[PDB]
């Protein structure tokens, strides 16, 4: 939070108040806080818009150099913690097995959305969606491809 | 299927006369279905099927023993049959003209754990056609 305002004299309020001038720019995303509103500041004159000097030769330098991961994408990590991780993954998806089980016998013949709204369980079909299974699958294939790529490099 | 059941039993056993009799009894429906030429083909390939099953059963079975088991009564015919089985590739039973040696299996190699995933990873191909069908079949009005 970086909010900038100006203090005003008593004359600005007795003249046409809201010293915000005639333009449609400072009304963009102008949400002063409640404590700012009850205080004079951020209410006396206006709230100043903020901008960041994201100039090139500066911003390209920051993104290229500071957030640096350049040869760190070659990690293999086949089973460093992954054998027990796969054990946990199987256990979690066994819980998904029970959840997706529970769902298929719920499966009522009264527009199952009606049943689901009042009987949310946050199960595999509902909240523990296929995205999580995709995360497990991506983790497995990434370790697979890294191991296989370095295996064929091993010549 | 009751004569078909007896045909299955004859295929497992390796006998000939019993199922030839039942074919002479109730083979007309097989002719109507158009499989009687195949029916005779099974009648004479019963020995081939029995050889496969007994080869899966045994590690080093004698050529005399297999001939006695499947009513060949001939060492040379038994050698020819196992020769014909191996060239067909249905079984791994080999020939050693000394006594009829056959190799056994081995522990799991690089591709023996991978051939299931290789032959089964079409799961996502099914998923994508299901999703594409949904895209085709989500008309709102």
């Amino acid at each position: 939070v970086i909010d900038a305002f100006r203090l005003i004299n008593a004359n600005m309020m007795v003249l046409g108040h809201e010293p915000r001038q005639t333009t449609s720019n400072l009304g963009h995303l102008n949400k002063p806080s409640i404590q700012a509103l009850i205080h004079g500041l951020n209410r006396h004159y206006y709230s100043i818009t903020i901008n960041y000097r994201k100039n090139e030769l500066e911003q390209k330098m920051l993104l290229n150099l500071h957030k640096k991961s350049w040869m760190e994408g070659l990690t293999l990590q086949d089973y460093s913690e992954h054998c027990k991780h796969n054990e946990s993954v199987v256990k979690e998806m066994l819980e998904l097995a029970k959840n997706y089980n529970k769902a298929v016998e719920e499966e009522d013949k009264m527009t199952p959305e009606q049943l689901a709204i009042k009987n949310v369980g946050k199960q595999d079909p509902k909240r523990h969606l296929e995205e999580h299974v995709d995360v497990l699958m991506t983790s497995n294939i990434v370790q697979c491809l890294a191991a296989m790529l370095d295996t064929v490099v091993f010549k | 299927l009751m004569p078909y059941f007896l045909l299955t039993q004859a295929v497992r056993t390796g006998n000939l006369a019993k199922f030839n009799q039942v074919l002479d009894q109730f083979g007309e429906k097989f002719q109507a279905d158009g499989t009687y030429t195949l029916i005779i083909r099974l009648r004479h390939n019963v020995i081939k099927t029995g050889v496969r099953m007994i080869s899966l059963s045994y590690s080093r079975i004698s050529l005399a023993d297999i001939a006695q088991k499947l009513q060949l009564d001939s060492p040379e015919d038994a050698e020819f049959i196992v020769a014909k089985a191996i060239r067909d590739g249905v079984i791994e039973a080999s020939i050693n003209h000394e006594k009829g040696y056959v190799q056994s299996k081995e522990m799991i190699d690089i591709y023996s754990t991978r051939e299931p995933q290789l032959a089964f990873h079409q799961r996502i191909s099914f998923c994508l056609d299901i999703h594409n069908m949904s895209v085709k079949a989500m008309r709102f009005p």
Binding site: M61, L62, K68, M71, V135, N140, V142, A147 | Q117
Partner: protein
Amino acid sequence: AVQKVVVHPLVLLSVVDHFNRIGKVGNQKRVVGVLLGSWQKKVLDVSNSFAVPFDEDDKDDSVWFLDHDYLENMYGMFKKVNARERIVGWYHTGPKLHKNDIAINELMKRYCPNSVLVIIDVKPKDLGLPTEAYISVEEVHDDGTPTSKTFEHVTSEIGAEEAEEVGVEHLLRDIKDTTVGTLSQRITNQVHGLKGLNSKLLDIRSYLEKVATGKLPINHQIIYQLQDVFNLLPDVSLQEFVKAFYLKTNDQMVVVYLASLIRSVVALHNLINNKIANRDAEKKEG
């Protein structure tokens, strides 16, 4: 004497801006100042920077000047506002290092005993390197070699300053240099990892070729001591894959059974639910 140095994502842009603002009239290409920070556990970090105008002449590289009174006043103010901050080294741009560095180090080491040099590439962004660290070691070049300067590179890694994550996220807010979009992001991770590996190893091959030609002096006494083991390390034997034929292939085949199938089944469930709804809607609309 330090084991290694770690550079924060806190001084790199400050140095670059200092280069930009003092390069308006000073086109010497040589920006020289001091980097302040802290050294606690054989890990040296930089938290503040300062630039001083600096002019050079190619004649023996001994023509220069600084504002030492102003720089010392800066250091006193910085220590007053933050006592833990101390001058960890002095920095010079122009990665093509000249010979005045020894005189500068001798003069500034009264502020820091283990005087170090830092080079910041304001314009260059070669692969990802923002800056490089240099340690002064003149204690005999080697066991059987003549005297030399031999400024070595102490290993440097970009640190993780706290509370700057909020600012950098707000600043960029366009690239999202995070693991978002896991599959595609890791594909990009593999891509530039291969790019970096190929580029650096090609550079090593070029160095070996140029050593073979002998046009440049050969620092073999550390090159083969560090690369022979690299070459002979037995990562080419495949019989350990034979021993580990199921290295993870069991996990590969369970994931095929339990990620691709599960995705197919849940997609199938969604489609058949949609098909039932569409069929009922079509039959009962009128």
